[PDB]
Structure 1
Amino acid sequence: KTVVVTTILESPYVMMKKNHEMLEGNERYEGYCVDLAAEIAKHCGFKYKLTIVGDGKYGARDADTKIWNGMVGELVYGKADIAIAPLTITLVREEVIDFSKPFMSLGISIMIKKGTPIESAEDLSKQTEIAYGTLDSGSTKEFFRRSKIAVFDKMWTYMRSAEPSVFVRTTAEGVARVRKSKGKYAYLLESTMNEYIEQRKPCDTMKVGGNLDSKGYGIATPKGSSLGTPVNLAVLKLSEQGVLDKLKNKWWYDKGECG
């Protein structure tokens, strides 16, 4: 059968090709996870169709109805066979879907407009002049909402009460907000995205400080799927053959624009 892959528009993992109007099917998209999908499919021996998740969400569970949205929802309710995306491995997700060993490491990080007098989360937490926010749904938001760490708790308590809202609906919105706010907004986002943006014109943002946590993205399958095992073996093989490194370099650094 043709494997249905759910994924999400997020640079440089999955992007629309420049002439995507005149192209169709999987050929409409480019990026790290596009390449990774091709590799995994080659190693597991399956045909596949790339589909952009309907609600443009990563995956969150409603506290009241217990219903999952986003890519995770697509997996749990039988809409997709596999998610190949920068989907963070988390405990609550692992309880309802299966993850491969991780294919890329990351941690929550801080993005500033160059010139901003901020070097750490503690720095942010100690002041109010510079606003700061996260993506409105996903593992970063959850990290802050659930954290028992003093500094991070202080930051969450600030963020959920800030007027107007400091949360954004896409990474693009967060980056744009950094660039337009003349140093008065800092954006908390996954280090991988931060590092990508740092390598792109107009070269006016930077990652500062260490990461706030350490985790990974994994390939996800519906719980108890037969695809789970071969997909995991493929991730291991791609890791050991240096393919994951080659792809990371390909999409992040090989054509860097900021030196």
Structure 2
Amino acid sequence: KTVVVTTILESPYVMMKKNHEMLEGNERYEGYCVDLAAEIAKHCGFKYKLTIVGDGKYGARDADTKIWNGMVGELVYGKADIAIAPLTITLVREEVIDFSKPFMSLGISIMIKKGTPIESAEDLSKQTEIAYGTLDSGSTKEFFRRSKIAVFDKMWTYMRSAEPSVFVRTTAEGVARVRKSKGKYAYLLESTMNEYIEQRKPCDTMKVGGNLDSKGYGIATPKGSSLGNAVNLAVLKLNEQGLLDKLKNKWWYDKGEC
């Protein structure tokens, strides 16, 4: 049977092709994860259908209902068989779903509009003229919410109460906000995305400072899935074969416009 793959529209991982309207099924999309999905399906020998997560979220647990949303939720509730996307491996998620060994290593980073007086997280936490936030329902927000280290704790105190909200529904929303904020907004996102955007027109943003942490993205499957073991070994094989590095260069810098 065809494996239902849940993913998210997030460049350069998954994007609709220029001529998607005249295309069908998986042919409508392109990106790092689209290529990854094809490679995995081939090595594990299965047919699949790419589907875009309904609520457009990565995955967080509602504190009140305890119900998971996003791709994590689609896996938890059996709406999808596997998630192939820039989904971060975290403790709370690992408790409800399975992750393969990472196919990409990254960390939380700072995105600024070129020229803003900020070079590090400590710099952001020591000022108020420049607002900053993170994506909603994700691992980055959880990071600051659950951080006991001085700098990040203070940043969270400011962000969780900030009015208007400094949080955004999608990476694209955060990037747009930085660009149109005349430098009065900094966005906290994973280095992978920061580095990608930094290489795209109008080439008006840049990553500053070192990453705040070190983690990875993993292919996720529901607990007790029969694809879990194989997919995990497939990821390792692809990394060692050099495919993952090949794909990283293909979608990040070979297509860079800055």
Name the SS for the 2:22 alignment partner: coil
- C-alpha displacement of 1:218: 0.1
- C-alpha displacement of 1:255: 2.2
Name the SS for the 1:165 alignment partner: coil
- Distance in 1 between residues matched to 2:65 and 2:130, nearest whole Å: 36
- C-alpha displacement of 1:26: 0.4
Name the SS for the 2:20 alignment partner: coil
Name the SS for the 2:123 alignment partner: helix
- Distance in 2 between residues matched to 1:14 and 1:3, nearest whole Å: 18
- Distance in 1 between residues matched to 2:73 and 2:170, nearest whole Å: 19
- Distance in 1 between residues matched to 2:139 and 2:206, nearest whole Å: 21
- C-alpha displacement of 1:6: 0.3
- C-alpha displacement of 1:165: 1.1
- C-alpha displacement of 1:222: 0.6
- C-alpha displacement of 1:254: 1.2
- Distance in 1 between residues matched to 2:255 and 2:140, nearest whole Å: 28
Q: Structure 2 length as normaliser, TM-score?
A: 0.99
- Distance in 2 between residues matched to 1:164 and 1:64, nearest whole Å: 23
Name the SS for the 2:151 alignment partner: helix
Aligned residue pair count: 258
Q: Structure 1 length as normaliser, TM-score?
A: 0.99
- Distance in 1 between residues matched to 2:128 and 2:27, nearest whole Å: 46
- C-alpha displacement of 1:20: 1.1
Pairs within 5 Å for 1:113-132: 113-132=113-132
Cα deviation digits, residues 117-144 of structure 1 (max 9, x gap): 1000000000001111101220000000
- Distance in 2 between residues matched to 1:172 and 1:255, nearest whole Å: 18
- C-alpha displacement of 1:79: 0.8
Aligned to 2:110: 110
Q: Return 63-72 or 26-35, whichever deviates more.
A: 63-72
Q: Return 108-117 or 64-73, whichever deviates more.
A: 64-73
Aligned to 2:244: 244
Cα deviation digits, residues 60-98 of structure 1 (max 9, x gap): 111122111110111111111100000000001111110
- Distance in 2 between residues matched to 1:236 and 1:165, nearest whole Å: 40
- Distance in 2 between residues matched to 1:51 and 1:171, nearest whole Å: 19
Cα deviation digits, residues 193-231 of structure 1 (max 9, x gap): 000000111111000000001000000001011100110
- C-alpha displacement of 1:28: 0.6
- Distance in 1 between residues matched to 2:23 and 2:181, nearest whole Å: 37
- Distance in 2 between residues matched to 1:256 and 1:54, nearest whole Å: 29
- C-alpha displacement of 1:237: 0.6
Cα deviation digits, residues 91-125 of structure 1 (max 9, x gap): 01111110000000110000000001100000000
Query: Is residue 197 of structure 1 aligned with residue 217 of structure 2?
Result: no
Runs of 4 or more consecutive aligned structure 1 residues displaced over 3 Å after TM superposition: none
- C-alpha displacement of 1:170: 0.7
- C-alpha displacement of 1:152: 0.4
- Distance in 2 between residues matched to 1:35 and 1:109, nearest whole Å: 26
Pairs within 5 Å for 1:39-188: 39-188=39-188
- Distance in 2 between residues matched to 1:256 and 1:20, nearest whole Å: 22
Mind listing any 5+ residue stretches in structure 2 that lack a counterpart? none
Mind listing any 5+ residue stretches in structure 1 that lack a counterpart? none
- Distance in 2 between residues matched to 1:129 and 1:26, nearest whole Å: 45
- C-alpha displacement of 1:256: 1.5
Identical aligned residues as a percent: 98
- Distance in 2 between residues matched to 1:66 and 1:114, nearest whole Å: 40
